[PDB]
Design an enzyme around this catalytic site. Structure first.
Site, PDB file in Angstrom:
ATOM      1  N   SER G  68       0.908  -1.107   0.000  1.00 33.69           N
ATOM      2  CA  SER G  68       0.000   0.000   0.000  1.00 33.69           C
ATOM      3  C   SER G  68       0.978   1.193   0.000  1.00 33.69           C
ATOM      4  N   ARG G  69       0.749   2.184  -0.858  1.00 35.64           N
ATOM      5  CA  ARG G  69       1.784   3.175  -1.267  1.00 35.64           C
ATOM      6  C   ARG G  69       1.278   4.559  -0.945  1.00 35.64           C
ATOM      7  N   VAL G  70       0.189   4.679  -0.109  1.00 34.94           N
ATOM      8  CA  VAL G  70      -0.393   5.855   0.376  1.00 34.94           C
ATOM      9  C   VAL G  70      -1.035   5.501   1.711  1.00 34.94           C
TER      10      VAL G  70
END
Lengths: 501, 187, 100, 470, 50, 469, 101
Positions: G68-70
């Site tokens: 997950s990049r946020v």
């Protein structure tokens, strides 16, 4: 200044004659249109839209005649009348296209003023007969030692350069054009090439770099650049090979030789796809047209060698097909292979391996065999073909980690040295005189005494050695173009005196 | 037979209707009676223009034909057979089309052409009469193809005229000359 | 507008002149158009499925397709002498071979 | 049917539709001729579309066509010339020479729509061709009356192969050959013309022993297609009326196929699997069926085929595999190694391989040859991975016998005095069977591999031993 | 150098808009009637040249 | 024009109108259909004959009553350009999305442009650094360059692009355009935030950026002409001011994609792979309206979203012809714990030569490709056997190739939080030294985790100590 | 559909509508036209695996193909601090255990 230019133009404009045809536009947009009427219309003829567009006409129907626009479609409106020019499409041909870029239709786009016209020609001329043709014997090189050495490049033959997009597809062609400097300078015009480079589907900036390259290396003075950039119309991309061929053909008639580069036919095909489906007529295999084969085959048989009751000219062709993420069995790629007489296959992996210019010797074929390599160059590359074909079986076995005998490892040791010799730097012209010494060394086993890393060091030094001492050996090769008894010995001694380094 | 095929869309009918009346030996009458009936269908109060797109039965349509042939008893028996064909195929959205198509075939057999000489604004009556004289002198009107000059007014003619007949035009309009003058001076 | 095989010129000019079917456009047939060895014959409204029909070109045919207007014949022999306006007699015997 | 006047309505490239006047039309498969500023345009009628509208395939270059341009009807099909005087003469789609000999000297003319011979006329092939090419003779024998097939991919020496067979056999026989070229290059046509005038096979004084039909790719896809048909009809005149056996050749037959696919699409027909025609089967059949042994005379084709990328899951080569009795594969690899011919003989199968046709002895020798070579090909993986393990004296002896055989497949050719400069040799059928028999027995397992290099018979191996000794 | 080359362009679109400005005055006048008439008599000469 | 008509049809976003006046229409005109949406602006793309035009619809198609009145504007839509477009975000028709109200201008220009000529061409051969090690060595960029990126999104494309903005627009500082075709709305807000914080957008002054945002929510037609809108702004900069600009796009595949949807409807028969037959003409124009001219040059960074991550499709394939340099990015390598995920064997530039970015640059770069490739060829062997069952010469190559592989990473300065390592920035000059070094065998004799998630050679050394303790 | 999911501003109560759309791949291959169309629009995967599922984690998470990049602007300081670079660490164990066997 500006006042004068504009006033001349008003004088130069207006006042049309009584018209003998009409038809009313209806469907229209995409660079493409359909008109109602028109009973004097010819197939391929040029029709003048009253917006300032011209569109050739490729389909006629007793309903609605399909005239494909060249010009911007935004100018064109419906319910306009169109007037048949009354002439099928043609270009001026003359020696005033030398050192200048011209587009699809044959007017200059490089701003180097009006061309010099000694004839007009037509874009469709088609192949000459069996009796006005003679066979090709005519040496020529590409300035890549590898290509020359392995496959028989001629003048009047068609050889298909195939392989993946942007692997220096253009760059491969540029080496040949640079190397075509050597014959052009030579006094005789029975040697001279006035090369014509056709660029289809490429951005303007690609073309603009290429002309700087040509002038810098002092090769722009016999070259012609024909263009049809990717924005410019689907007809005009289609018309770009055919009008290049008419420019090429004028040299042929005069009894002078020239060479035609068709980079890329793959993008010509894509244009014709867009055209054929917007005249809503069935395509062949993979949406590409049904008459696409007719286009490549007719074109290609016009670069032909002539007999001695004619000019004794020969236009040479190099097709280029960029395969989109490979595929050699794709419909445009398959068709062209069949038409060409040789392949100079360029392989993508070998590029990273450091074998640039990249070629793969099995995928590259000659059906009729060697007959257009320089005779000297034939003598030295005699066992070069047998070695490299063998090296490929032996190498594959060899690296597994298995046990090998000394006999199998003579192939590995021998091949590795040969492959490394082939390596050359792009944009570097080469001469027969300096490819004959290097192949001798390689074949006759004097590059095994020299370590693999310093084979490249060796090449440049061996040829320099000869400039000071055995400068006689090089001259005999240039002058006689063959190796006799004496020349083999002379050279066998020349390799020996400098094997070091 | 056709006096050469003209019109692909609904000219296939017009062709039939015409070839059938060539063997009767009255095409002109046929055309005339159909023409008057074509108008009186259109000028029907409610459901003239307002029923031309079928959404009923083929049988309800057949009875639309039946009620039409009461409006005039002169229409000829061959144009009565044409109606049947049209009622059964259930087409009435290009009804007046066949009638006009038939007029074009018919009036070519008469040797009349219907030309237009479109202009910016009406030209003089001496101008008209000079143009009809001029066309007759020329071979653009060969006779048997005799225009009736109908002036039409087009706001996209900025002067000048364009003369029209057959597939032949002579264009000395101003709109074309200015469009071309402008373009070169911005080229 | 749309395509039908009653918008063919031979069909229309005969109906307008008050000519009927008359067992010639009901059983027999007449070719309208033949191409690709797929003759399409006008009539044969009384016909069985895939029934054997005999042309005036010597060629015999089958009826894989029975559509409203036309009966779309498929021809078994060569197209060389096959042409438009042929009478295509209804053999009245479905395709058969000797058994025994 | 009869000469009439029609006017063009639609020009869609090669495809040309005409709208002939009511009740008057030509019949299917006829020839229409239309006046054009480029020879006489011939249009082949291929459909009726109703109301007297025909749709045609072009036979001559299209350009400058007006809708409304008069079209005559010949009343019949495209009619070529045939004869024992059209031998040396060149003929194309409309029967005109392209090496400018002007109008053909005609005894008789014939239609190119000739319906195939029936089963009553059939005869069983018993006459046996010899090609004098050892690898071919031994491992896939041809028989004269056959339908030979030169399967290969791209650039594999097919033309060079055909050039040797025509140079040798045509002169040898008292029969005829007609060499037909379908959609092939003007470089090749000009080479094929030049080399075969030199050797004495085609000669202007006297009656030539091989005729030419050059149909080339600059011409229309339609025009290219019915070139093959053109050649066949000449062979048929020879078969029938003249009563002579024919040794046919066609080159390359994929060009024939490709052309029909293209025109299937333009006519509006729906293409089949992998971009091939739906009419693929029957078109090959029509040509193959006409080429057959009747009690009139034989017709023996030798047909080059182009097989995309040495691939045979592609449907057009695979369908063609059925029709052809005595297949051979010209593998790309064999050529490069320096072995001439390019034939790989473990992928060639023949139906003309019996054991009382060619005798017991022939079959049995070749059987041992098949196994001996294939065990050696099987051991290559074994050396590749294992190394020098899992071997035997028996394997060593097989490997050695096979490498002696492998280099015993090369036979130089006269028509490759231009490729390598090594001149021809001719090896009799009985002679090859003997020489191969000797090696198997292991009497010539003492003569080195390179001493079978570019030999013919048995005499030749012994002589090439002395050279290497000396 | 760059300003001179813009200035040549600016001259060419500015004198372009005078041609339009002059056309509006002609299409205002009863020259709009009188010159249409000239076209008209020219078309009589044209059809007579056939 | 005073041409009026009524709406015959409303099929998706491709409304067809039929003009009741005989005054004839022109191609690339615009029509306004009076809507309860205020107004809907449409663009004629076809005339189908009989005065029945066919029009592309930008905004919504809920509310369009059939037989509803039009008035024809008579020409193309003109957006607003200037230096008064700086610090504003504009919609396709011009509207503020950041709501600093109406967009001011001195020049408002047609969306479409006519691509520069061969005559107007100029050349470049300049060196531009991002500062990224793998990009610089193997695929160096230039000033006025056109760059290409590939492989899917939601895997670091946004971040990657954000990082390119973070380096190049602050090493330049002049004019810049961000144009986002079919932008993901939640991310678009992170750019707005990110920029204001990093000092780019400044609205108590004027910004060093101007912006275009079109979201992927929006009907196909709007999405097609976000891109053309953006280009009008960049040309203003290129030409009128006389200065070089920047351009970033995430993603341009959308231009292609949206045009594919509208094509079927318009009349056009679409080619195989379902892609429009007009890809070539649209591509041709865009890539030649971003081009190095005599005035300015628009140095652009383009992000392509690839479907199924296949280049064998015609839409991505036809683009490569118009790009000087590529840096193909593949999702798998991103998964492996390596950022940037750019493939080192599937990278190219026409400016990587032995005298363009110098000879040292070429030798280093050449060696890495040769080393990694051999290793790629042997991947089967290495796994089925062992790594001493290989021949000896190869054992050195394989070991060498493994170090380079872990080395390739360079933590991002904009995603420093998410990697969990601080953002590293290093020079083209520092990078040439660092790769040179690894190839010399200088600090080859130390763990493979030492080269794992670190930028240049210097960082590697510092980390050996960290593992050692 | 997907971009209607939105964390809004404090003018709007600061509301949410969290999207979690669940894609069913053919045969555990994440590159096909439908998976890839959904992947471009979203950020991260929560790629799930059948082998791990049988093996005692119901439901199973594959963290080598899930990011997950946020995700780490939504988390609290505790679960930031304790979890810091732990995401890397179980992808260091991935490298190790590939060449351990």
């Amino acid at each position: 200044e500006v006042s004068s230019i504009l006033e001349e133009r008003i004088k130069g404009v207006s006042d049309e004659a009584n018209l003998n045809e009409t038809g009313r536009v209806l469907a229209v947009g995409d660079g493409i249109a359909r008109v109602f009427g028109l009973n004097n219309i010819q197939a391929e003829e040029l029709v003048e839209f009253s917006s300032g567009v011209k569109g050739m006409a490729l389909n006629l129907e007793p309903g609605q005649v399909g005239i494909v626009l060249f010009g911007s479609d935004r100018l064109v409106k419906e319910g306009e009348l169109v007037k048949r020019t009354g002439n099928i499409v043609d270009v001026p041909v003359g020696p005033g296209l030398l050192g200048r870029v011209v587009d699809a239709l044959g007017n200059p786009i490089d701003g180097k003023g009006p061309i010099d016209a000694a004839g007009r020609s037509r874009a469709q001329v088609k192949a000459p007969g069996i009796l006005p043709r003679r066979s090709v014997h005519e040496p020529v090189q590409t300035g890549l030692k590898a290509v020359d050495a392995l496959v028989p490049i001629g003048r009047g033959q068609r050889e298909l350069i195939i392989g993946d997009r942007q692997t220096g597809k253009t760059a491969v062609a540029l080496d040949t054009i640079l190397n075509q400097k050597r014959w052009n300078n030579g006094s005789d015009e029975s040697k001279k090439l006035y090369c014509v480079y056709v660029a289809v589907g490429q951005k303007r900036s690609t073309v603009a770099q290429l002309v700087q390259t040509l002038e810098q290396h002092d090769a722009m003075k016999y070259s012609i650049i024909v263009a049809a950039t990717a924005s410019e119309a689907a007809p005009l991309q289609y018309l770009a090979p055919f009008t290049a061929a008419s420019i090429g053909e004028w040299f042929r008639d005069n009894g002078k030789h020239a060479l035609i580069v068709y980079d890329d036919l793959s993008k010509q095909a894509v244009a014709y796809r867009q055209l054929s489906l917007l005249l809503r007529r069935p395509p062949g295999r993979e949406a590409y047209p049904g008459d696409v084969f007719y286009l490549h085959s007719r074109l290609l048989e016009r670069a032909a060698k002539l007999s001695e009751k004619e000019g004794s000219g020969s236009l040479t062709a190099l097709p280029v097909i960029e395969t989109q993420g490979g595929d050699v069995s794709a419909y445009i790629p398959t068709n062209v292979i069949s038409i060409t007489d040789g392949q100079i296959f360029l392989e993508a992996e070998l590029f990273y391996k450091g074998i640039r210019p990249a070629i793969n010797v099995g995928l590259s074929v000659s059906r009729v065999g060697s007959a257009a390599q320089v005779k000297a160059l034939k003598q030295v590359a005699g066992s070069l073909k047998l070695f490299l074909a063998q090296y490929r079986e032996v190498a594959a076995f060899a690296q597994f980690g298995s046990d090998l005998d000394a006999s199998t490892k003579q192939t590995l040791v021998r091949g590795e040295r040969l492959t490394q010799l082939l390596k050359q730097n792009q944009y570097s012209p080469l001469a027969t005189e300096e490819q004959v010494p290097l192949i001798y060394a390689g074949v006759n086993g004097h590059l095994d005494g020299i370590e693999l890393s310093r084979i490249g060091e060796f090449e440049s030094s061996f040829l320099s050695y000869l400039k000071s001492n055995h400068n006689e050996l090089l001259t005999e090769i240039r002058e006689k173009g063959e190796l006799s008894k004496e020349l083999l010995a002379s050279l066998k001694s020349a390799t020996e005196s400098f094997v070091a380094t | 037979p056709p006096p050469v095929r003209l019109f692909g869309v609904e000219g296939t009918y017009a062709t039939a209707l015409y070839q059938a009346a060539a063997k009767n030996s009255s095409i002109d009458a046929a055309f005339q009676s159909l023409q008057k009936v074509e108008s009186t269908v259109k000028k029907n109060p409610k459901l003239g223009h307002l029923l031309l797109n079928p959404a009923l039965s083929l049988k309800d349509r057949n009875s639309v034909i039946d009620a039409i042939v009461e409006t005039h008893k002169n229409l000829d028996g061959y144009v009565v057979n044409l109606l049947k064909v049209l009622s059964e195929n259930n087409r009435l959205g290009c009804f007046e089309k066949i009638a006009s198509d038939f007029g074009v075939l018919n009036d070519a057999h008469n040797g009349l052409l219907k030309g237009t000489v479109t202009s910016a604004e009406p030209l003089d009556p001496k101008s008209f009469k000079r143009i009809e004289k001029a066309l007759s002198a020329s071979k653009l009107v060969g006779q048997g193809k005799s225009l009736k000059l109908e002036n039409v007014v087009k706001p996209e003619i900025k002067g000048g005229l364009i003369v029209e007949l057959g597939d032949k035009t002579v264009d000395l309009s101003i709109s074309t000359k200015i469009q071309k003058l402008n373009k070169v001076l911005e080229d | 507008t749309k395509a039908q095989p009653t918008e063919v010129s031979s069909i229309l000019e005969e109906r307008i002149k008050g000519v009927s079917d008359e067992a010639n456009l009901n059983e027999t047939g007449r070719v309208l158009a033949v191409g690709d060895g797929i003759a399409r014959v006008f009539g044969l409204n009384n016909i069985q499925a895939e029934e054997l029909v005999e042309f005036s070109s010597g060629v015999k045919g089958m009826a894989l397709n029975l559509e409203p207007g036309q009966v779309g014949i498929v021809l078994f022999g060569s197209d060389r002498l096959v042409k438009e306006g042929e009478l295509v007699k209804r053999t009245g015997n479905i395709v058969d071979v000797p058994v025994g | 049917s009869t000469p009439i006047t029609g006017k063009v309505t639609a020009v869609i490239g090669a495809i040309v539709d005409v709208h002939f006047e009511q009740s008057e039309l030509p019949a299917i498969l006829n020839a229409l001729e239309i006046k054009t500023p480029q020879g006489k345009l011939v249009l082949e009628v291929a459909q009726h579309l109703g109301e007297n509208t025909v749709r045609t395939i072009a036979m001559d270059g299209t350009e400058g066509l007006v809708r409304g341009e008069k079209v005559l009807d010949t009343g019949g099909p495209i009619s070529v010339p045939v004869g024992r005087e059209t031998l040396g003469r060149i003929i194309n789609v409309i029967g005109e020479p392209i090496d400018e000999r002007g109008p053909i000297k005609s005894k008789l003319r014939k239609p190119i729509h000739a319906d195939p011979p029936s089963f009553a006329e059939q005869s069983t092939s018993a006459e046996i061709l010899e090609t004098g090419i050892k690898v071919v003779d031994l491992l896939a024998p041809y028989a004269r009356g056959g339908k030979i097939g030169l399967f290969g991919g791209a650039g594999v020496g097919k033309t060079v192969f055909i050039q040797e067979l025509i140079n040798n056999i045509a002169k040898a026989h008292g029969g005829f050959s007609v060499f037909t070229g379908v959609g092939e290059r003007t470089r090749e046509g000009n080479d094929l013309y030049r080399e075969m005038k030199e050797t004495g096979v085609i000669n202007l004084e006297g009656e030539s022993k091989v005729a030419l039909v050059f149909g080339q790719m600059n011409e229309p896809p339609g025009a290219r297609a019915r070139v093959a048909l053109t050649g066949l009809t000449i062979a048929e005149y020879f078969r029938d009326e003249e009563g002579q056996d024919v040794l046919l050749f066609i080159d390359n037959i994929f060009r024939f196929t490709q052309a029909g696919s293209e025109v299937s699409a333009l006519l509006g027909r729906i293409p089949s699997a992998v971009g091939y025609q739906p009419t693929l089967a029957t078109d090959m059949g029509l040509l193959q069926e006409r080429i057959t042994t009747t009690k009139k005379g034989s017709v023996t084709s030798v047909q080059a085929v182009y097989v995309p990328a040495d691939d045979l899951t592609d449907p057009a080569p695979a369908t063609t595999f059925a029709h052809l009795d005595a297949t051979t594969v010209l593998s790309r690899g064999i050529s490069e190694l320096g072995i001439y011919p390019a034939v790989d003989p473990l992928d060639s199968k023949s139906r003309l391989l019996d054991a009382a046709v060619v005798g017991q002895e022939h079959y049995d020798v070749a059987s041992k040859v098949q196994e001996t070579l294939q065990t050696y090909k099987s051991l290559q993986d074994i050396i590749a991975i294992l190394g020098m393990d899992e071997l035997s004296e028996q394997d060593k002896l097989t490997v050695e016998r096979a490498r002696k055989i492998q280099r015993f497949l090369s036979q130089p050719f006269a028509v490759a005095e231009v490729f390598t400069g090594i001149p021809g040799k001719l090896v009799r059928l009985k002679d090859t069977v003997a020489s191969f028999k000797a090696v198997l027995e292991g009497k010539y397992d003492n003569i080195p591999e390179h001493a079978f290099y570019m030999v013919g018979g048995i005499e030749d191996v012994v002589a090439k031993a002395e050279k290497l000794a000396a | 150098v760059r300003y001179e080359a813009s200035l040549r362009q600016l001259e060419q679109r500015q004198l372009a808009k005078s041609v339009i400005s002059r056309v509006q005055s002609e299409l205002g006048n009863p020259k709009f009637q009188e010159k249409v008439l000239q076209q008209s008599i020219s078309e009589i000469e044209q059809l007579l040249s056939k």
